[PDB]
Design a protein around this ligand. Structure first.
Ligand SMILES: [Cl-]
Ligand SMILES: [Mg+2]
Ligand SMILES: [Mg+2]
Ligand SMILES: [Mg+2]
Length: 234
């Protein structure tokens, strides 16, 4: 029988507008993550968060261990950047594709780098965005569709590395054989046509998918860094 993860691919692209690529991604065994950094040291924040997350998960690759790795990542980034004249930090969305005996796949997320599931040709967002716009969506006041270009979607309400305490969302992922997961930074949906994003995301080869997703985002203007992780499940 099949493993829970069949294959995965990642891509990151600075795009033609931003002066730095402050996004980072991770694909490490059953652990996958995207971190979207912000601020003068946003690159430092996202890279340090993922380095720390990877190390912590390796030392304790279970649900509690993943949560304590996210706490560790928060503290490490805060210790390194918290002293700076301006605020820098990062989002973090991590997925651990645990087998059923370890509770099944788990998402831990902070900020606005979403997790999507692609099932039967549909792509749906599984996570809450911790932004001003994300709160409006939660309450039913705007659609997700609406929210992608809301003037306040860039105002984060949770981030890693900006203080000593964080409360990420933590939930199991309802997924199974044939499903695909996509973790992305917000840059993917900054401007491109949703149908075109789904077309790219559904490309049979995950390595083609991630390249097409970066191309779609850049063709549409590439206003932000775009980073994607595609995971095919078994
Ligand atoms: Cl930048
Ligand atoms: Mg960023
Ligand atoms: Mg313990
Ligand atoms: Mg971004």
């Amino acid at each position: 029988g099949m493993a829970s993860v069949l294959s995965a691919a990642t891509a990151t692209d600075q795009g033609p507008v931003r002066e730095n690529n402050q996004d980072a991604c991770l694909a490490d065994g059953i652990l996958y993550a995207v971190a979207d950094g912000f601020g003068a040291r946003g690159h430092h924040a996202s890279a340090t968060a993922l380095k720390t997350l990877s190390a912590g998960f390796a030392a304790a690759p279970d649900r509690d261990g993943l949560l304590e790795a996210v706490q560790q990542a928060n503290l490490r980034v805060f210790e390194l950047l918290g002293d700076e004249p301006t605020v820098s930090g990062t989002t973090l969305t991590a997925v651990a594709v645990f087998e059923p005996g370890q509770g099944g796949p788990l998402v831990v997320n902070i900020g606005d780098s979403p997790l999507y599931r692609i099932r039967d040709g549909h792509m749906e967002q599984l996570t809450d965005d911790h932004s001003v716009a994300g709160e409006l969506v939660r309450m039913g006041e705007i659609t997700r569709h609406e929210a992608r270009w809301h003037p306040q979607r860039h105002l984060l309400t949770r981030a890693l590395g900006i203080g000593p305490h964080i409360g990420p969302d933590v939930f199991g992922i309802d997924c199974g054989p044939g499903d695909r997961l996509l973790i992305s930074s917000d840059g993917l949906f900054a401007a491109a046509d949703e149908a075109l994003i789904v077309d790219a995301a559904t490309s049979p080869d995950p390595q083609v998918a991630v390249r097409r997703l970066v191309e779609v985002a850049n063709d549409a203007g590439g206003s932000d860094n775009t980073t994607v992780v595609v995971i095919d499940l078994g």
